[PDB]
Amino acid sequence: NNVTEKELFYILDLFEHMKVTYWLDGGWGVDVLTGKQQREHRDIDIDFDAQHTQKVIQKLEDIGYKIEVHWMPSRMELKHEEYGYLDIHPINLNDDGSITQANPEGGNYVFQNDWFSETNYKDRKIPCISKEAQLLFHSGYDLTETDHFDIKNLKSIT
């Protein structure tokens, strides 16, 4: 049921084939920063260009993902019988160079651009959020045992 490296690569291929700018986030994002798989994963988190929201959802449905949680335009969780869980997060990629997310209520989060980057993982280049961003969006007073493991793995990155 867990999301294997091969299944992650397939999802990465989907977005790249669709020419949708995106970055891997969450737990697989942590492992990718370390250069190898560290643990089993329930899910993949992908942050993606919000202008392609409709065709991203449609393609995921087309290959068998079922929508289970729809918190859009903030977040959506889908589930595939083989590929596992996938959470997508639409983000706004503005012509003025800025990268934003709508504030669930009022306003816009303005991300730091260098929080979105790329790493060479087993000689594939994978766009992903940075180690710094991973630590920033983790919450120190709200950590699971698995969060603790991931944070230690980030620390081991030279």
Q: Does 136 bind a second copy (CB under 8 A)?
A: yes
Looking at beta carbons only, is 45 or 49 nearer to ligand 3QB? Answer: 45
Q: What minimum distance in Å lies between the beta carbon of 96 and Mg ion?
A: 29
Q: How far is CA 133 from the centre of its chain?
A: 12
Cβ-based nearer residue to a second copy, 21 or 117: 117
Instruction: Rule CB under 8 A: say whether 71 interacts with a second copy.
Output: no
Could you tell me the two tokens for 69? 């949680």
CB of 108 to a second copy, least distance (A): 11
- Burial of residue 14 (CB within 10 Å: 0-12, 13-18, 19+) is middle
What is the CB neighbour count within 10 angstroms for residue 138? 15
- When asked if residue 137 is in the footprint of a second copy (CB under 8 A), the reply is yes
- Taking residue 107's Cβ as centre, other Cβ atoms within 10 Å add up to 9
Q: What part of residues 39-68 is at the interface with ligand 3QB (CB under 6 A)?
A: 45, 47
Q: By CB under 5 A, is residue 94 in contact with Cl ion? A: no
Can residue 27 be called a binding residue for Mg ion (CB under 5 A)? yes
Cβ-based nearer residue to Mg ion, 26 or 49: 26
> Do residues 27 and 43 touch, judged by C-beta distance below 8 A?
yes
Q: Which stretch binds Cl ion (CB under 5 A): 42-50, 54-62, 107-115, 122-130?
A: 107-115
Dist CA 94 CA 102 (whole Å): 12
Min dist. Cβ of residue 47 to ligand 3QB (A): 5
71 binds ligand 3QB (CB under 6 A): no
Q: What is the four-CA torsion angle of 118, 90, 70, 141, rounded to 10 degrees?
A: 60
